[PDB]
Amino acid sequence: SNTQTVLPFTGLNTPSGVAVDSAGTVYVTDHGNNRVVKLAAGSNTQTVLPFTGLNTPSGVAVDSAGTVYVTDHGNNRVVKLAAGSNTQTVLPFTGLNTPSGVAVDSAGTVYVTDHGNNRVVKLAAGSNTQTVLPFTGLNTPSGVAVDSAGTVYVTDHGNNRVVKLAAGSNTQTVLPFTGLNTPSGVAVDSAGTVYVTDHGNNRVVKLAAGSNTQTVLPFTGLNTPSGVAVDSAGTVYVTDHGNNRVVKLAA
Ligand SMILES: [Cl-]
Ligand SMILES: [Cl-]
Ligand SMILES: [Cl-]
Ligand SMILES: [Cl-]
């Protein structure tokens, strides 16, 4: 599609992350209002998720159980809320510094871009022991995504590039995007196509698995886009950060 739609959220303030679940419900970190909002497909009435004490939250993810995970950026912590629960829990990460993105794989492993420490950390389901992933040379990494094969994709924000690590690998590779400015968000769909918010160029770009030629998606009028998600139908959702809105484009 080249007809973008603005989702009917209301009262957003410089939103920062977006996630979409298997039913098409959209979840947004409403960064400047210290809250997380949720909108079912076809609804025009958002709700606010009952997180507690968030400080300029940045990243959001939703797992197969519908549990919502948020990087509570200003509190140096990651929290999660089971669907229909009113009580969040704090995940047992250690040493985080303004965390910025979060992803969860099919095994429940939680991946976090530990932004201010230039690293990516992960926690397995039920574990208290985080691991630092063997990326190298990251500058203020800003988004993370993980595909069905366990390959981890990271927007290396300060180095204008996207890197990936295959499961079990100790050596990253750089994806062949071109011309990125301070990339923020990243998403990967079931076919392995990688979508990136090219933050400083006000555009969203994508790269099919095996391709060396990116495509620019036909969004218009974006301002410093900040997060991206893709649903099972291939619809791409972007937090249009500087325009206080969320926009989508069917494939
Ligand atoms: Cl901001
Ligand atoms: Cl901030
Ligand atoms: Cl930064
Ligand atoms: Cl910005």
PDB file of C-alpha atoms and ligand atoms in Angstrom:
ATOM      1  CA  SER A   1       0.000   0.000   0.000  1.00  0.00           C
ATOM      2  CA  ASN A   2       1.014   3.604  -0.369  1.00  0.00           C
ATOM      3  CA  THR A   3      -1.936   4.922   1.669  1.00  0.00           C
ATOM      4  CA  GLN A   4      -0.802   5.378   5.226  1.00  0.00           C
ATOM      5  CA  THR A   5      -3.372   5.513   8.014  1.00  0.00           C
ATOM      6  CA  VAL A   6      -3.019   7.416  11.287  1.00  0.00           C
ATOM      7  CA  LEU A   7      -4.152   5.177  14.148  1.00  0.00           C
ATOM      8  CA  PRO A   8      -6.830   6.749  16.374  1.00  0.00           C
ATOM      9  CA  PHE A   9      -4.762   7.112  19.523  1.00  0.00           C
ATOM     10  CA  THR A  10      -5.363  10.336  21.425  1.00  0.00           C
ATOM     11  CA  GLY A  11      -3.203  12.603  23.563  1.00  0.00           C
ATOM     12  CA  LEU A  12       0.158  11.030  22.696  1.00  0.00           C
ATOM     13  CA  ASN A  13       3.338  12.885  23.626  1.00  0.00           C
ATOM     14  CA  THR A  14       6.385  12.175  21.448  1.00  0.00           C
ATOM     15  CA  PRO A  15       5.762   8.386  21.378  1.00  0.00           C
ATOM     16  CA  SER A  16       8.883   6.166  21.232  1.00  0.00           C
ATOM     17  CA  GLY A  17       8.103   2.451  20.733  1.00  0.00           C
ATOM     18  CA  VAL A  18       5.424   0.267  19.122  1.00  0.00           C
ATOM     19  CA  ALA A  19       4.572  -3.434  19.271  1.00  0.00           C
ATOM     20  CA  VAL A  20       1.700  -5.442  17.763  1.00  0.00           C
ATOM     21  CA  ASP A  21       0.325  -8.752  18.966  1.00  0.00           C
ATOM     22  CA  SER A  22      -1.051 -11.753  17.118  1.00  0.00           C
ATOM     23  CA  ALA A  23      -4.601 -10.260  17.142  1.00  0.00           C
ATOM     24  CA  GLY A  24      -3.467  -6.935  15.706  1.00  0.00           C
ATOM     25  CA  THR A  25      -3.681  -5.021  18.969  1.00  0.00           C
ATOM     26  CA  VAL A  26      -1.174  -2.144  18.938  1.00  0.00           C
ATOM     27  CA  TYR A  27       0.895  -1.171  22.005  1.00  0.00           C
ATOM     28  CA  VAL A  28       2.711   2.176  22.238  1.00  0.00           C
ATOM     29  CA  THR A  29       5.173   3.653  24.744  1.00  0.00           C
ATOM     30  CA  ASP A  30       3.743   7.148  25.135  1.00  0.00           C
ATOM     31  CA  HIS A  31       7.171   8.413  26.096  1.00  0.00           C
ATOM     32  CA  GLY A  32       6.417  11.929  27.175  1.00  0.00           C
ATOM     33  CA  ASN A  33       3.361  10.912  29.231  1.00  0.00           C
ATOM     34  CA  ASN A  34       5.184   8.159  31.167  1.00  0.00           C
ATOM     35  CA  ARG A  35       2.691   5.492  30.151  1.00  0.00           C
ATOM     36  CA  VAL A  36       1.882   2.634  27.776  1.00  0.00           C
ATOM     37  CA  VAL A  37      -1.297   2.690  25.709  1.00  0.00           C
ATOM     38  CA  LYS A  38      -3.075  -0.048  23.797  1.00  0.00           C
ATOM     39  CA  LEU A  39      -5.546  -0.044  20.890  1.00  0.00           C
ATOM     40  CA  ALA A  40      -7.376  -3.093  19.501  1.00  0.00           C
ATOM     41  CA  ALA A  41      -7.772  -3.429  15.734  1.00  0.00           C
ATOM     42  CA  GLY A  42     -10.825  -1.566  14.490  1.00  0.00           C
ATOM     43  CA  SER A  43     -11.277   0.222  17.838  1.00  0.00           C
ATOM     44  CA  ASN A  44     -11.181   3.972  18.239  1.00  0.00           C
ATOM     45  CA  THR A  45     -10.772   3.916  22.040  1.00  0.00           C
ATOM     46  CA  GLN A  46      -7.342   3.325  23.533  1.00  0.00           C
ATOM     47  CA  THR A  47      -6.756   2.077  27.038  1.00  0.00           C
ATOM     48  CA  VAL A  48      -3.821   2.770  29.378  1.00  0.00           C
ATOM     49  CA  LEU A  49      -1.992  -0.278  30.703  1.00  0.00           C
ATOM     50  CA  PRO A  50      -1.658  -0.375  34.523  1.00  0.00           C
ATOM     51  CA  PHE A  51       2.091  -0.028  34.748  1.00  0.00           C
ATOM     52  CA  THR A  52       3.349   1.841  37.823  1.00  0.00           C
ATOM     53  CA  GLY A  53       6.017   4.491  38.175  1.00  0.00           C
ATOM     54  CA  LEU A  54       7.392   4.609  34.621  1.00  0.00           C
ATOM     55  CA  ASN A  55       9.906   7.341  33.708  1.00  0.00           C
ATOM     56  CA  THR A  56       9.966   8.318  30.010  1.00  0.00           C
ATOM     57  CA  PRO A  57       9.558   4.716  28.800  1.00  0.00           C
ATOM     58  CA  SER A  58      11.125   3.939  25.475  1.00  0.00           C
ATOM     59  CA  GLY A  59      10.793   0.382  24.097  1.00  0.00           C
ATOM     60  CA  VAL A  60       7.911  -2.093  24.155  1.00  0.00           C
ATOM     61  CA  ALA A  61       7.478  -5.738  23.140  1.00  0.00           C
ATOM     62  CA  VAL A  62       4.739  -8.345  23.457  1.00  0.00           C
ATOM     63  CA  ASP A  63       5.333 -12.092  23.675  1.00  0.00           C
ATOM     64  CA  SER A  64       3.184 -15.014  22.558  1.00  0.00           C
ATOM     65  CA  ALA A  65       1.373 -15.047  25.964  1.00  0.00           C
ATOM     66  CA  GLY A  66       0.435 -11.380  25.543  1.00  0.00           C
ATOM     67  CA  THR A  67       2.813 -10.252  28.275  1.00  0.00           C
ATOM     68  CA  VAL A  68       3.960  -6.693  27.654  1.00  0.00           C
ATOM     69  CA  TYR A  69       7.607  -5.755  28.285  1.00  0.00           C
ATOM     70  CA  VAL A  70       8.731  -2.128  28.633  1.00  0.00           C
ATOM     71  CA  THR A  71      12.140  -0.482  28.928  1.00  0.00           C
ATOM     72  CA  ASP A  72      11.548   1.970  31.781  1.00  0.00           C
ATOM     73  CA  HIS A  73      14.278   4.180  30.353  1.00  0.00           C
ATOM     74  CA  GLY A  74      14.570   6.835  33.065  1.00  0.00           C
ATOM     75  CA  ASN A  75      14.507   4.247  35.870  1.00  0.00           C
ATOM     76  CA  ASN A  76      17.273   2.057  34.353  1.00  0.00           C
ATOM     77  CA  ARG A  77      15.099  -1.046  34.458  1.00  0.00           C
ATOM     78  CA  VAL A  78      12.877  -3.348  32.399  1.00  0.00           C
ATOM     79  CA  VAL A  79       9.335  -4.202  33.577  1.00  0.00           C
ATOM     80  CA  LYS A  80       6.630  -6.593  32.394  1.00  0.00           C
ATOM     81  CA  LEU A  81       2.867  -6.971  32.798  1.00  0.00           C
ATOM     82  CA  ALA A  82       0.904 -10.146  32.105  1.00  0.00           C
ATOM     83  CA  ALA A  83      -2.226  -9.576  30.014  1.00  0.00           C
ATOM     84  CA  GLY A  84      -5.102  -8.619  32.301  1.00  0.00           C
ATOM     85  CA  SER A  85      -2.788  -8.296  35.298  1.00  0.00           C
ATOM     86  CA  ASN A  86      -2.645  -5.077  37.272  1.00  0.00           C
ATOM     87  CA  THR A  87       0.753  -5.830  38.902  1.00  0.00           C
ATOM     88  CA  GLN A  88       3.983  -5.392  36.960  1.00  0.00           C
ATOM     89  CA  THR A  89       7.219  -7.100  37.844  1.00  0.00           C
ATOM     90  CA  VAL A  90      10.797  -5.885  37.419  1.00  0.00           C
ATOM     91  CA  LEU A  91      13.048  -8.191  35.414  1.00  0.00           C
ATOM     92  CA  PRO A  92      16.374  -9.209  37.105  1.00  0.00           C
ATOM     93  CA  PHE A  93      18.750  -7.384  34.808  1.00  0.00           C
ATOM     94  CA  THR A  94      21.784  -5.744  36.400  1.00  0.00           C
ATOM     95  CA  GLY A  95      23.818  -2.674  35.603  1.00  0.00           C
ATOM     96  CA  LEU A  96      21.515  -1.158  32.980  1.00  0.00           C
ATOM     97  CA  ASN A  97      22.016   2.453  31.848  1.00  0.00           C
ATOM     98  CA  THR A  98      19.013   4.173  30.162  1.00  0.00           C
ATOM     99  CA  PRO A  99      17.787   1.039  28.352  1.00  0.00           C
ATOM    100  CA  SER A 100      16.153   1.785  24.993  1.00  0.00           C
ATOM    101  CA  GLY A 101      14.825  -1.307  23.231  1.00  0.00           C
ATOM    102  CA  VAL A 102      13.446  -4.707  24.157  1.00  0.00           C
ATOM    103  CA  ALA A 103      12.575  -7.890  22.255  1.00  0.00           C
ATOM    104  CA  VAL A 104      11.327 -11.323  23.325  1.00  0.00           C
ATOM    105  CA  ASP A 105      11.775 -14.572  21.391  1.00  0.00           C
ATOM    106  CA  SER A 106       9.562 -17.633  21.173  1.00  0.00           C
ATOM    107  CA  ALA A 107      11.373 -19.208  24.142  1.00  0.00           C
ATOM    108  CA  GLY A 108      10.639 -16.194  26.353  1.00  0.00           C
ATOM    109  CA  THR A 109      14.233 -14.923  26.302  1.00  0.00           C
ATOM    110  CA  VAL A 110      14.297 -11.143  26.796  1.00  0.00           C
ATOM    111  CA  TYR A 111      16.825  -9.020  24.875  1.00  0.00           C
ATOM    112  CA  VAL A 112      17.567  -5.415  25.893  1.00  0.00           C
ATOM    113  CA  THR A 113      19.625  -2.671  24.302  1.00  0.00           C
ATOM    114  CA  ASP A 114      21.553  -1.337  27.290  1.00  0.00           C
ATOM    115  CA  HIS A 115      21.873   2.018  25.560  1.00  0.00           C
ATOM    116  CA  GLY A 116      24.194   3.923  27.886  1.00  0.00           C
ATOM    117  CA  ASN A 117      26.522   0.943  28.238  1.00  0.00           C
ATOM    118  CA  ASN A 118      26.891   0.307  24.495  1.00  0.00           C
ATOM    119  CA  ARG A 119      25.844  -3.343  24.791  1.00  0.00           C
ATOM    120  CA  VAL A 120      22.985  -5.816  24.324  1.00  0.00           C
ATOM    121  CA  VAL A 121      22.057  -8.077  27.236  1.00  0.00           C
ATOM    122  CA  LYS A 122      19.698 -11.033  27.414  1.00  0.00           C
ATOM    123  CA  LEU A 123      17.822 -13.014  30.071  1.00  0.00           C
ATOM    124  CA  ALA A 124      16.435 -16.507  29.502  1.00  0.00           C
ATOM    125  CA  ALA A 125      12.945 -17.313  30.798  1.00  0.00           C
ATOM    126  CA  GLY A 126      13.094 -18.064  34.521  1.00  0.00           C
ATOM    127  CA  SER A 127      16.770 -16.999  34.735  1.00  0.00           C
ATOM    128  CA  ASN A 128      18.343 -14.494  37.132  1.00  0.00           C
ATOM    129  CA  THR A 129      21.641 -14.454  35.186  1.00  0.00           C
ATOM    130  CA  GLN A 130      21.921 -12.103  32.235  1.00  0.00           C
ATOM    131  CA  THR A 131      24.394 -12.645  29.399  1.00  0.00           C
ATOM    132  CA  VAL A 132      26.104  -9.905  27.373  1.00  0.00           C
ATOM    133  CA  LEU A 133      25.834 -10.704  23.691  1.00  0.00           C
ATOM    134  CA  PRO A 134      29.144 -10.711  21.782  1.00  0.00           C
ATOM    135  CA  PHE A 135      28.482  -7.622  19.663  1.00  0.00           C
ATOM    136  CA  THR A 136      31.336  -5.179  19.357  1.00  0.00           C
ATOM    137  CA  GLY A 137      31.805  -1.515  18.577  1.00  0.00           C
ATOM    138  CA  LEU A 138      28.238  -0.450  19.358  1.00  0.00           C
ATOM    139  CA  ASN A 139      27.470   3.257  19.973  1.00  0.00           C
ATOM    140  CA  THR A 140      24.325   4.006  22.042  1.00  0.00           C
ATOM    141  CA  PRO A 141      22.391   1.061  20.544  1.00  0.00           C
ATOM    142  CA  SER A 142      18.696   1.916  20.292  1.00  0.00           C
ATOM    143  CA  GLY A 143      16.569  -1.019  19.030  1.00  0.00           C
ATOM    144  CA  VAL A 144      16.642  -4.807  19.022  1.00  0.00           C
ATOM    145  CA  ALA A 145      14.693  -7.524  17.249  1.00  0.00           C
ATOM    146  CA  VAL A 146      14.978 -11.320  17.192  1.00  0.00           C
ATOM    147  CA  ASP A 147      13.705 -13.649  14.461  1.00  0.00           C
ATOM    148  CA  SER A 148      12.367 -17.200  14.620  1.00  0.00           C
ATOM    149  CA  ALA A 149      15.890 -18.620  14.121  1.00  0.00           C
ATOM    150  CA  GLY A 150      17.177 -16.662  17.144  1.00  0.00           C
ATOM    151  CA  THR A 151      19.154 -14.192  15.054  1.00  0.00           C
ATOM    152  CA  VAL A 152      19.417 -10.894  16.969  1.00  0.00           C
ATOM    153  CA  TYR A 153      19.273  -7.575  15.043  1.00  0.00           C
ATOM    154  CA  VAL A 154      20.413  -4.287  16.589  1.00  0.00           C
ATOM    155  CA  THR A 155      20.285  -0.650  15.453  1.00  0.00           C
ATOM    156  CA  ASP A 156      23.780   0.605  16.187  1.00  0.00           C
ATOM    157  CA  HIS A 157      22.402   4.127  16.503  1.00  0.00           C
ATOM    158  CA  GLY A 158      25.644   6.088  16.867  1.00  0.00           C
ATOM    159  CA  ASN A 159      27.381   4.269  13.989  1.00  0.00           C
ATOM    160  CA  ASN A 160      24.553   4.647  11.466  1.00  0.00           C
ATOM    161  CA  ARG A 161      24.260   0.923  10.852  1.00  0.00           C
ATOM    162  CA  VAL A 162      22.356  -2.247  11.672  1.00  0.00           C
ATOM    163  CA  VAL A 163      24.194  -5.339  12.909  1.00  0.00           C
ATOM    164  CA  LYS A 164      23.119  -8.904  13.476  1.00  0.00           C
ATOM    165  CA  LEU A 165      24.251 -12.004  15.361  1.00  0.00           C
ATOM    166  CA  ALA A 166      23.126 -15.484  14.464  1.00  0.00           C
ATOM    167  CA  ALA A 167      22.264 -17.807  17.329  1.00  0.00           C
ATOM    168  CA  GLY A 168      25.456 -19.289  18.754  1.00  0.00           C
ATOM    169  CA  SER A 169      27.702 -16.941  16.752  1.00  0.00           C
ATOM    170  CA  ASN A 170      30.461 -14.906  18.385  1.00  0.00           C
ATOM    171  CA  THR A 171      30.956 -12.534  15.417  1.00  0.00           C
ATOM    172  CA  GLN A 172      28.451  -9.965  14.173  1.00  0.00           C
ATOM    173  CA  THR A 173      27.835  -8.956  10.585  1.00  0.00           C
ATOM    174  CA  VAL A 174      26.744  -5.567   9.258  1.00  0.00           C
ATOM    175  CA  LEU A 175      23.554  -5.546   7.193  1.00  0.00           C
ATOM    176  CA  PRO A 176      23.863  -3.838   3.771  1.00  0.00           C
ATOM    177  CA  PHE A 177      21.643  -0.865   4.457  1.00  0.00           C
ATOM    178  CA  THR A 178      22.829   2.381   2.901  1.00  0.00           C
ATOM    179  CA  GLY A 179      22.658   6.013   3.960  1.00  0.00           C
ATOM    180  CA  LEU A 180      21.201   5.572   7.448  1.00  0.00           C
ATOM    181  CA  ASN A 181      21.152   8.500   9.903  1.00  0.00           C
ATOM    182  CA  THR A 182      21.037   7.577  13.610  1.00  0.00           C
ATOM    183  CA  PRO A 183      18.734   4.568  13.104  1.00  0.00           C
ATOM    184  CA  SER A 184      16.420   3.879  16.014  1.00  0.00           C
ATOM    185  CA  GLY A 185      13.982   1.033  15.731  1.00  0.00           C
ATOM    186  CA  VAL A 186      14.215  -2.379  14.071  1.00  0.00           C
ATOM    187  CA  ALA A 187      11.670  -5.175  13.419  1.00  0.00           C
ATOM    188  CA  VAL A 188      11.947  -8.531  11.590  1.00  0.00           C
ATOM    189  CA  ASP A 189       9.036 -10.483  10.117  1.00  0.00           C
ATOM    190  CA  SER A 190       8.556 -14.249   9.710  1.00  0.00           C
ATOM    191  CA  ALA A 191      10.213 -14.156   6.263  1.00  0.00           C
ATOM    192  CA  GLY A 192      13.345 -12.522   7.712  1.00  0.00           C
ATOM    193  CA  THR A 193      12.739  -9.103   6.146  1.00  0.00           C
ATOM    194  CA  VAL A 194      14.356  -6.422   8.341  1.00  0.00           C
ATOM    195  CA  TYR A 195      12.605  -3.044   8.840  1.00  0.00           C
ATOM    196  CA  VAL A 196      14.449  -0.037  10.281  1.00  0.00           C
ATOM    197  CA  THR A 197      13.351   3.457  11.283  1.00  0.00           C
ATOM    198  CA  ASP A 198      15.976   5.671   9.646  1.00  0.00           C
ATOM    199  CA  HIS A 199      15.396   8.275  12.357  1.00  0.00           C
ATOM    200  CA  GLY A 200      17.464  11.166  11.043  1.00  0.00           C
ATOM    201  CA  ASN A 201      16.202  10.782   7.453  1.00  0.00           C
ATOM    202  CA  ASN A 202      12.513  10.680   8.396  1.00  0.00           C
ATOM    203  CA  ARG A 203      11.888   7.375   6.616  1.00  0.00           C
ATOM    204  CA  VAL A 204      11.468   3.636   7.092  1.00  0.00           C
ATOM    205  CA  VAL A 205      13.582   1.218   5.070  1.00  0.00           C
ATOM    206  CA  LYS A 206      13.448  -2.524   4.627  1.00  0.00           C
ATOM    207  CA  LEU A 207      15.757  -5.291   3.457  1.00  0.00           C
ATOM    208  CA  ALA A 208      14.578  -8.749   2.390  1.00  0.00           C
ATOM    209  CA  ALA A 209      16.615 -11.734   3.566  1.00  0.00           C
ATOM    210  CA  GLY A 210      19.438 -12.304   1.115  1.00  0.00           C
ATOM    211  CA  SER A 211      19.053  -8.899  -0.544  1.00  0.00           C
ATOM    212  CA  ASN A 212      21.705  -6.230  -0.950  1.00  0.00           C
ATOM    213  CA  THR A 213      19.200  -3.566  -2.034  1.00  0.00           C
ATOM    214  CA  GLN A 214      17.018  -1.783   0.488  1.00  0.00           C
ATOM    215  CA  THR A 215      13.546  -0.416  -0.262  1.00  0.00           C
ATOM    216  CA  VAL A 216      12.197   2.836   1.199  1.00  0.00           C
ATOM    217  CA  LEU A 217       8.632   2.376   2.371  1.00  0.00           C
ATOM    218  CA  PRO A 218       6.178   5.004   1.044  1.00  0.00           C
ATOM    219  CA  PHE A 219       5.395   6.766   4.335  1.00  0.00           C
ATOM    220  CA  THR A 220       5.119  10.549   4.085  1.00  0.00           C
ATOM    221  CA  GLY A 221       5.395  13.405   6.526  1.00  0.00           C
ATOM    222  CA  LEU A 222       7.264  11.500   9.245  1.00  0.00           C
ATOM    223  CA  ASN A 223       9.256  13.425  11.911  1.00  0.00           C
ATOM    224  CA  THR A 224      12.188  11.569  13.552  1.00  0.00           C
ATOM    225  CA  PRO A 225      10.390   8.174  13.512  1.00  0.00           C
ATOM    226  CA  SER A 226      11.421   6.120  16.529  1.00  0.00           C
ATOM    227  CA  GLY A 227       9.981   2.593  16.607  1.00  0.00           C
ATOM    228  CA  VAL A 228       8.667   0.112  14.070  1.00  0.00           C
ATOM    229  CA  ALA A 229       6.624  -3.093  14.310  1.00  0.00           C
ATOM    230  CA  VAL A 230       5.277  -5.548  11.735  1.00  0.00           C
ATOM    231  CA  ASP A 231       2.259  -7.787  12.248  1.00  0.00           C
ATOM    232  CA  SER A 232       1.572 -11.236  10.867  1.00  0.00           C
ATOM    233  CA  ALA A 233      -0.255  -9.660   7.869  1.00  0.00           C
ATOM    234  CA  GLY A 234       2.852  -7.629   6.895  1.00  0.00           C
ATOM    235  CA  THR A 235       1.374  -4.290   7.981  1.00  0.00           C
ATOM    236  CA  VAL A 236       4.123  -1.915   9.163  1.00  0.00           C
ATOM    237  CA  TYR A 237       3.506   0.364  12.186  1.00  0.00           C
ATOM    238  CA  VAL A 238       5.717   3.373  12.962  1.00  0.00           C
ATOM    239  CA  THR A 239       5.828   5.758  15.920  1.00  0.00           C
ATOM    240  CA  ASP A 240       5.963   9.101  14.140  1.00  0.00           C
ATOM    241  CA  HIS A 241       7.759  10.558  17.151  1.00  0.00           C
ATOM    242  CA  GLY A 242       7.843  14.249  16.314  1.00  0.00           C
ATOM    243  CA  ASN A 243       4.228  14.348  15.119  1.00  0.00           C
ATOM    244  CA  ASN A 244       2.787  12.740  18.294  1.00  0.00           C
ATOM    245  CA  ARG A 245       1.160   9.925  16.315  1.00  0.00           C
ATOM    246  CA  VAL A 246       1.351   6.337  15.139  1.00  0.00           C
ATOM    247  CA  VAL A 247       0.975   5.527  11.426  1.00  0.00           C
ATOM    248  CA  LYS A 248       0.591   2.284   9.541  1.00  0.00           C
ATOM    249  CA  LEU A 249       0.979   0.959   6.015  1.00  0.00           C
ATOM    250  CA  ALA A 250      -0.443  -2.334   4.815  1.00  0.00           C
ATOM    251  CA  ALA A 251       2.051  -4.341   2.792  1.00  0.00           C
TER     252      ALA A 251
HETATM  253 CL    CL B   1      11.999  12.621  23.206  1.00  0.00          CL
HETATM  254 CL    CL B   2      14.527  10.399  27.276  1.00  0.00          CL
HETATM  255 CL    CL B   3      21.632   8.693  21.836  1.00  0.00          CL
HETATM  256 CL    CL B   4      14.261  12.776  18.485  1.00  0.00          CL
END
